[PDB]
């Protein structure tokens, strides 16, 4: 019944491509993220589409092994997670670099002006790099300061550890090391569930788009907050969604282990 396996692989590829393209469109075209992408280039879309693909793959990863072909699909899903995590990490490295360069006076004037938001009590920041520290020390400080940065570093390290310790040789001839170090998936999922708790990547609020009109106020950056047509924009980030995708498989695997 190789037809079923081929159909499953093709459906998986189609779903991954569809999710990537759809979320790229979501985070690239709409004017809600107009200022966000004005600050982050296309790195915004390139970091938030692999996020959706990673939610999908992290939902899929644990199902094959929950006994109560399949291991091949598990390996393919793990490698897809690795690929999408690589794209996500590279895009967010670009985001961190540009954000830190903008916070200090080392970027284009419009990006710097956008970065000034949030310094007052009644302002919501767009540039999540708040401390005015130069590079590369600024990016390193963000990595260990932001909850997203810390959790991302931890889960990425455990991901490389799992991948490198799940190689064929270690898995056939040193199954003890493989099995003992494979339980880093616990840390992986614990970090991934709280990864987006802070909501640092922010798009313009839903209501702020009504009072603040993008095409009327794009080039009035300096006058925001002191002319009627251009109230200072308010930004807000999405709530954490990956826990919704990951909780199901975690519960199923926990039930399976309890059965074992």
């Amino acid at each position: 019944n190789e037809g079923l396996s081929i159909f499953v692989i093709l459906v998986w590829l189609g779903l991954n491509v569809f999710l990537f393209v759809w979320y790229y469109r979501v985070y690239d075209i709409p004017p809600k993220f107009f200022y966000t992408r004005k600050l982050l280039g296309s790195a915004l879309a390139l970091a938030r589409a692999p996020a959706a693909c990673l939610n999908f793959n992290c939902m899929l990863i644990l199902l094959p092994v929950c006994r109560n072909r399949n291991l091949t699909f598990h390996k393919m899903v793990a490698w897809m997670i690795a690929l999408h995590s690589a794209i996500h990490t590279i895009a967010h490295l670009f985001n961190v670099e540009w954000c830190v360069n903008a916070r200090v006076n080392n970027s284009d004037p419009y990006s710097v002006a956008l970065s000034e938001l949030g310094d007052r009590q009644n302002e919501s920041y767009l540039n999540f790099a708040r401390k005015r520290i130069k590079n590369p020390e600024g990016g390193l400080y963000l990595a260990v300061t932001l909850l997203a940065g810390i959790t991302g570093v931890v889960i990425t390290l455990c991901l490389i550890l799992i991948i490198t310790s799940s190689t064929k040789t270690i898995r056939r001839s040193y199954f003890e090391v493989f099995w003992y170090t494979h339980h880093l998936f616990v840390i992986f999922f614990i970090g991934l569930a709280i990864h987006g708790a802070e909501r640092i990547v922010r798009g313009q609020t839903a209501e702020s788009l009504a009072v603040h009109n993008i095409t009327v106020c794009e080039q009035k950056i300096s006058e925001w907050g002191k002319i009627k047509e251009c109230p200072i924009p308010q930004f807000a980030g999405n709530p954490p969604m990956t826990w919704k995708w990951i909780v199901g498989p975690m519960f199923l695997y926990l039930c399976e282990r309890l059965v074992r």
Epitope: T215, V216, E218, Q219, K220, I221, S222, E223, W224, G225, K226, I227, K228, E229
Partner: antibody, heavy 119, light 110 residues
Framework: SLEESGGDLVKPGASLTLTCTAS?????????MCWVRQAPGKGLEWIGC???????TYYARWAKGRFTISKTSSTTVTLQMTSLTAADTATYFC???????????????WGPGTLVTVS | ALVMTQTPSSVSAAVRGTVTIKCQAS??????LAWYQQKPGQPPKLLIY???KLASGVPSRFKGSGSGTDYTLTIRDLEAADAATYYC????????????FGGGTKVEIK
Amino acid sequence: SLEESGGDLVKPGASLTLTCTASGIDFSGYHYMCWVRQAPGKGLEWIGCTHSGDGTTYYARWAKGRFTISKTSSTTVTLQMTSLTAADTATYFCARRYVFSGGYSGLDSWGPGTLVTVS
Amino acid sequence: ALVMTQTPSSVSAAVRGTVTIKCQASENIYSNLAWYQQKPGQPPKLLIYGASKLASGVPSRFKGSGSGTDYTLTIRDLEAADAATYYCQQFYDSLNTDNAFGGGTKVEIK
């Protein structure tokens, strides 16, 4: 500096265009370019403004329907008046609303002004 | 609509005296105000561009102040060359406003 061309005796109900040509200033930054008129012996009356970059144009409520301000070139801005009446006789100033660093605006540069007579 | 009213339509003060010109907004303009001095037969000269921020070349004699709807202009050591007319312009609201300039105040030297 700025200077307003045009401005001549005009029969009521006709149309006239005042051209504001700069010398040393380019209308391509983020500052506006407003038109202000002052009837003989009266206070200043604001007509409208034209952002240099966006192109958005604002007019006073009385001038919205019959005054057109357009940035024809990088140094010349034109105000077109239609359905002129005797009440539109006044000295028309061309002023640059310089958006200073803090974000607060002020009509930094003013033109000498051109008399317009409607009768 | 937003209308500015300059209550002291005509104020007189002797040389080295002080003159207070009040320009109150009908609506809360967020300190975006400008004070111009227009000598007869001359384009107005900007004095204050912020609510109280002096313009280039304008001495500290011309003080702006106030916040919200009430703003003031003051002249510490009024000279003989200050016999001009002073206007206040609000840049906050330009959508629906009959006139940005707040009427006009004529300053006389005693």
